[PDB]
């Protein structure tokens, strides 16, 4: 039982793809939100020239 419980720690520490997948989805949303600022900047500049 000691070794069975010892080994579980290493894999858990090394691999956390569940939380890194949540992180990946959040990063996808982050990058989706970010470029909207540049898009609105372009539209604002065109409207300002007009």
């Amino acid at each position: 039982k000691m070794q069975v419980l010892f080994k579980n720690l290493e894999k858990a520490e090394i691999k956390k793809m569940d939380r890194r997948n949540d992180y990946d989805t959040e990063a996808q949303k982050l990058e989706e939100q970010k470029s909207k600022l540049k898009g609105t900047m372009e539209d604002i500049t065109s409207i300002q020239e007009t």
Partner: protein
């Protein structure tokens, strides 16, 4: 003496078993570093 050494050793068995088991879940430490970056990115997205 037989049964007393048995009980002593078995209590040691359980003590070490759970003392090892608790640490493994603390791989949620690395998981929490990942979720720290999670919260940083989430904060940064709403910023823009």
């Amino acid at each position: 003496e037989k049964e007393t050494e048995i009980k002593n050793l078995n209590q040691k068995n359980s003590k070490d078993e759970q003392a090892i088991t608790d640490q493994g879940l603390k791989a949620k430490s690395d998981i929490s570093i990942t979720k720290k970056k999670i919260m940083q990115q989430q904060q940064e997205a709403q910023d823009l």
